[PDB]
Structure formats: structure tokens, C-alpha cells
Nucleic acid binder design. Structure first.
Lengths: 48, 120, 43, 110
RNA sequence: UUAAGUUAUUAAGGGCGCACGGUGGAUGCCUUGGCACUAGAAGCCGAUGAAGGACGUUACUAACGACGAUAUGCUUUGGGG
RNA sequence: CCGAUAGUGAACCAGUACCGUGAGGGAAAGGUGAAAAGCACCCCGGAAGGGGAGUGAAAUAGAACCUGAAACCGUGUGCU
RNA sequence: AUGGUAGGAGAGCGUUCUAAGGGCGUUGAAGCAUGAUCGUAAGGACAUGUGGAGCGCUUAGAAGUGAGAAUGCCGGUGUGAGUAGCGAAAGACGGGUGAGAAUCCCGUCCACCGAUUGACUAAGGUUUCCAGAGGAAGGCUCGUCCGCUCUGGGUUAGUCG
RNA sequence: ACGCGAGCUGGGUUCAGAACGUCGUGAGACAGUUCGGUCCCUAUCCGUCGUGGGCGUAGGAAAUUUGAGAGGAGCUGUCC
RNA sequence: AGAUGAUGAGGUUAAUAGGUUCGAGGUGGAAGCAUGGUGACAUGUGGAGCUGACGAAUACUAAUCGAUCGAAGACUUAAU
């Protein structure tokens, strides 16, 4: 129940392809505010 | 329903102390689900104290802790007296809701999708 | 559980100690060696 | 045209941080700051701090326009790992890593 | 225009060359130290208190060394500049 | 005859740290620059760290400081 | 004529040092890296950058003389893997501090121990003590806190022992 | 692998204690029995069961579908 | 529906969830009155009173602002 061989770096990187992090939305405030995420309190340059 | 990954007795006690403090402040900051589920609770407490009957008074004293707001001018009363004397009137017309809620950002220590809760 | 080494200062100073090791020839032999090694410490 | 900024030997793993940095590669300083203020890690605000000083450099020193500034390149690389211990009733130990952060920002030109 | 046929266009990622960095501390060079020898001295101290030490004494001053209530030293001469 | 995995255990904080009830066992650790002239002053930064400026023949010579390999980790890239 | 193991004989390739000779070298040595060059081989030159001082050539002499393996020794590095794990006890809210808060302070409520996780005296441990200042390092996360660091203070006996 | 213990137990072995019978000068042996007596592992590769991501089908999208093939199913009994 | 993510239902022109109201269902006669009762207790007021997941209804509360992506019908030949 332990490694028999070694992890080749190619195989490592292959595995951790989907090991990522996606993004936030970050719209503007056409309702009230500066550029700030949609439909939201002022998080940064916002009012609504 | 929701459990909070916590025990039943701790849970009940937490919720009732929550709603107590809430009544004191009229809004507070906490997490999401704890607010989601003190929501219905205190909605029902309002639904009680909208009536002022002694029966409901008794039923509420179950849940409300035994607390003293020092109101202004060195004036003091309890959450109970407040509820049956100040707040029932306010939403005396309304037919639900009575609260609102405000998503906010994570906390530092965690990914705590925190929230403010207030009255409406 | 109990492990070893329940210390006593006096007992340390008794089975060790200057006046102890200096009683016996076979005691005094070692101090020479500690001095010979220049080990900083005796007893 | 370009400006540097560099954080020396920061108490974070390069793999802990390389991901939060693998996004703003190719972007603008403005959107990038927003992204940093939105992602809920601990690497972020540091990187933000670095960015602010980078552009403080590019302005106070080179005086380029802070809006046509894209991210030229940014990465980080290893640093001087240190070592600490673990009780377990008998000997055991581990390492605390570090990081060398580098971010270069250009006005997209020569 | 329809058929029948060929054929692209993708790199999420990876590989191969190239370049640029980082870590780390080999290599190169060097010596402060040592090893083995040569020749000549010397071989060995203490109850007048030994070796070996502990406590102290200094501008700061940490240890190391020096000296010990005359305590980071005194008298003395000869040199000394 | 060796030139810091050598040479004595010990070129520095050595019989020391440390270990051991106790005898006893017992390490690691050298190199700025000719000169410290050891980065005045500005900017970001909570600070650290930096970027400029400035010194220096040289600061990818900046105190952990001569060269600075390899494993390893990274960014770009031409062909796939 | 010329497959070839133990093995035998022979020819050699290089490394360090010494003598002599003759030389190179801040107009940049040694090392270092690159490279599409030469040699039948051990290997050797050249140019190119870094490098910032000593080194080759010829001849002969001498040797701690040539390493891929010894479940070899010493150091650094990975892999596993962002995995496994993060050691006992009910917390919640507000207010505050502050660059920065779940983890610090203050308050309220709640909860737990309950012949005790309580209080004493010893042994043993030796300044961990208190008052300030500190995030650099330590704290199994965090950290404005600390049994962490710095500074400065701190233990009083005829009856106690 | 007298199918399977990195899937379970260990009742028996075989362990060290002990008894009996026999043999052995004895130390001990037998097997002749008897009571009792410690079963480790965070799954890297293939493999398997499920689940997604990526891209491609010479225009792009939504929905419905043929099915090349693959898997599954076939047990009995009884009164009239 | 579901480890996750995928699936699905909805996203203000809105019944998605919650609340409120009603109901269902469950439990078993609330409190306060009054009466009886020396008392414990009992009766009526009253299938009362309460009721988490269930059902309807009601926009009272929140799913609003808004952002990102997203093609330009290839060739050959015979028909056309």
C-alpha cells in the first residue's frame, strides 16, 4: 500500500492539470456603484 | 432540516441566545446558515408577540433568555417587554418577512461566507 | 506509567560528587581522565 | 517602460502561490487588483502589496501611465527552507518553506 | 444546389530543442591551522600549601584571557621614546 | 606533508553544544572590499523587503557578502 | 591473421607534486558554461561569454593516481501529496483594539468540573514571576496574545521551616 | 497458489508455562494426550465499480432518435 | 437530484425557498374562568389546545443591477 516506483514529473503535471482555481465574476455597477460585481453591496467601488 | 454539525441541545441553546442578542441589536453579523435558521425562529416570535396574549407571553419566555437591555435615559427592560411593547406595533400590519439579510465576503480565518441580518 | 529517573539532588551528589569519587583510588582514577580529556565538568 | 518588484523569502510555498499568480499573467493592473481582492486566500493581499509598490516605482521613477500598464510577467521561485521538529514521544521533524516573488509590469511597448 | 471523396481548424495539458532565473553549496584559489621530522635545551612539580579549579576584579563588554581585595594589577631598577 | 568531507576530535562558539542515571561517548561550523568608503536622500510598504539615487574599478561584490557546478524548481519560448 | 570470460603478455590516455629548461599571463590566469572542431581510445585543442589571479608546455622523476553499484558514509534534493494528520472538555453576540481579527481585551448570556481539572503543603523544577516594548524567530492554523524576545524590577522572619 | 487472509476469524498447529503416560542414568525426547497462550499496512501503477472534465464528428445551436453492438433474463412445484 | 461536481426545478412579467393564513395529519382536552370537591382531584367553558419536514394560497422577505463566450458553410469530382 505504498509506492512501488517513482512519480515522473510528466505524470505528476498530467495529474494536476485540473488542479487549478477559476475566477470571480466582477461586473460593473450599472445599478449604483463603480466597477463592482453584479447585483451586490459595495465590495470594491460599489453601491448596489 | 439543518443540523450545523452540532448537537441538539447546544444547537437549541445557540439559536435562542442568537435571537436574544439579535433582538437587542436589531442586526448582527454571523455566518450564513445560522442566520438562515434563526430566520424562521424569530419570525415566529414576532408572530407571537403580535398578539400580546398571556399564553404567547408564556410560550415566548421559553425561548427568550432572561436579559436586560438598559435602554436610554438609564431605562431598563427585558427582551420580552421590548418584544411585546415596541416591535409588535412596528410590523403589526405585515404578513411575513419581518427580516432581511445581507451577503458579505469571506472571513480571514476561514471561507466563512458571512452575512449581516437585520429587520424588515 | 512510570519511567526511570525520579531524581534526587542529594542522591546525585552522593553516588557522584567530589567527596565521593575522591575516597577511592578507583574513583580518583577517572578525574585524571576527565582532566586528561579536559572535559569541562566533574561530578 | 518596465518596472520591477520583488518579495524576498516569503513564508509561503511556491506551489501555494503559483496558482493565484497563474491567472493575472497577461492582464491589466486594474482587473488584476480586483481579482486579488476577491480571491479568499492568504497569498492574495501580499501580492497586492507587491503590486502597489511596483507601480509606485513605475510612477515615481519612470513616470508611465498607470492604465496602459499590463502585467508583463510574474512568477515566484523557491527560497531558503528552514526546519522545525515534532514531538511524537521520540524524534521527528519537518520544514517550513519560503518564496521569492517577482513581478514585472510593462507599458506594453519599448 | 445535392451528392461521393479528401482535408483541415485544439492544446486543456504534455514532450523535444533554446534562452533566462532561482535554490544549493561542489569546484577553483587562498590560509588562520595542523602532521611528521632535524639540532640544541630540558627533563620533575608540592605542606612555605601543588596541579587543577570555583568565585571575583575591568568604562562599556558578552565570553576568552590577565590579575586576584594592592584584583584588566602595585614597587623596583635597566631599557623604553 | 594536508589545505576546511582534508589536516588532530577540534583552523571559528571544542572535549564544546548535545547525548548518557552513570561511568563514558562526542559533532557541525573558514573566505565583503584595496579601503566600510557597510547603500545619504526619494517612492511603495504596518514592517520586512524592495526600486531609484548614491559609493565603489565592480553592489546580479550589499554582510547569510569570492567564484557559485549538479540534483531540484520555475518563466518564456521555435517544432510537435 | 585479428569473436571472447577467469587469466597471461604488451602498448598506452590522463590526474597531483618535484627538478631543469623554456614560457603564458589585469590587453584578463585558474576554474565555470556553451559550441556544428581534432584524435582509433583513454582524451585534447580553439573561439565565444562569466571569471578576476596565478597556470601550462618539454624531459625525467615520484604517488593518499582515475569509482556506478559494497541494503557503503556525509550533505543537499525530491517522490509520495497539497495526500494522511492538525491530542479530550459548549459556546454565541455585541462593543473595542487596532494596517490587519473566529483565535487578543471588555461585557452579557450560556455551558463544563464538581471529594474536583478546586484549594494547600512538599519534593522536583530554577526566574518560566511582575511592569513595559517587540514581530523579526518559536507557538502544530491564526495572532494586535504568549510559559517567545528585549528592557527594567521583583523573594525581607528571635516564633514559619 | 489443495479458488480468495495487503477482505474476516484462528478453532489446530508451533512458540515460550504446566500436567499425565511411556522412553531416557540425566540433561531431555515422544506424540500419547491434556489446559492455556500477540494475526502490521495513509493504495503509487494496472485492474474493477461509478462519476466528471477536455476535445471531435467541413456552418453553428436545441430537442428527439435509428442502433453497430454489449449486458441481462430462461428455476421448479401444485389443485382441477 | 445529490460525496463533490454533474441532474433538475426557478431566478420579480416571478410563487423558487422562507414567512403569514388556512388545511391536512398527529396528539389528546390548553390556559383562564366557573363549579363541585376538606383534600388530593373532577366537570363545563372546548375533538379544546399545540402541531418539524406535508398541501394550498398570499409576493410580506430574498433570488434585480449586470457581466463573459459564442458562427461566418473548406476543397475535389459528377451531377447540378
Amino acid at each position: 500500500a505504498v509506492p512501488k516506483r517513482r512519480t515522473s514529473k510528466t505524470r505528476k503535471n498530467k495529474r494536476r492539470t485540473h488542479f487549478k482555481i477559476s475566477v470571480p465574476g466582477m461586473t460593473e455597477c450599472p445599478n449604483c456603484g463603480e466597477y463592482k460585481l453584479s447585483h451586490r453591496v459595495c465590495k470594491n467601488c460599489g453601491s448596489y | 432540516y439543518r443540523k450545523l454539525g452540532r448537537t441538539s441541545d447546544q444547537r437549541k441553546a445557540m439559536l435562542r441566545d442568537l435571537a436574544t442578542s439579535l433582538i437587542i441589536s436589531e442586526r448582527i453579523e454571523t455566518t450564513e446558515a445560522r442566520a438562515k435558521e434563526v430566520r424562521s425562529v424569530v419570525e415566529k416570535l414576532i408572530t407571537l408577540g403580535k398578539k400580546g396574549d398571556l399564553a404567547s407571553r408564556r410560550n415566548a419566555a421559553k425561548t427568550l433568555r432572561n436579559v436586560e437591555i438598559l435602554n436610554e435615559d438609564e431605562t431598563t427592560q427585558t427582551a420580552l417587554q421590548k418584544l411585546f411593547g415596541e416591535i409588535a406595533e412596528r410590523y403589526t400590519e405585515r404578513q411575513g418577512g419581518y427580516t432581511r439579510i445581507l451577503k458579505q465576503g469571506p472571513r480571514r480565518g476561514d471561507g466563512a461566507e458571512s452575512v449581516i441580518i437585520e429587520l424588515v | 506509567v512510570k519511567r526511570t529517573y525520579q531524581p534526587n539532588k542529594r542522591k546525585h551528589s552522593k553516588v557522584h560528587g567530589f567527596r565521593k569519587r575522591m575516597s577511592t583510588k578507583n574513583g580518583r582514577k577517572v578525574l585524571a581522565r576527565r582532566r586528561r580529556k579536559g572535559r569541562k565538568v566533574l561530578s | 517602460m518596465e518596472a520591477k518588484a520583488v518579495a524576498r523569502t516569503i513564508r509561503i510555498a511556491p506551489r501555494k502561490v503559483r496558482l493565484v499568480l497563474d491567472l493575472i499573467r497577461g492582464k491589466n493592473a486594474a482587473e488584476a487588483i480586483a481579482i486579488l481582492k476577491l480571491t479568499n486566500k492568504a497569498s492574495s493581499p501580499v501580492i497586492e502589496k507587491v503590486l502597489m509598490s511596483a507601480l509606485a516605482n513605475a510612477e515615481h521613477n519612470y513616470d508611465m501611465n498607470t492604465d496602459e500598464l499590463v502585467v508583463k510577467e510574474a512568477y515566484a521561485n523557491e527560497g531558503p527552507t528552514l526546519k522545525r521538529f515534532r514531538p511524537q514521544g521520540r524524534a521527528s521533524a519537518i520544514n517550513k518553506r519560503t518564496s521569492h516573488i517577482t513581478i514585472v509590469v510593462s507599458d506594453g511597448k519599448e
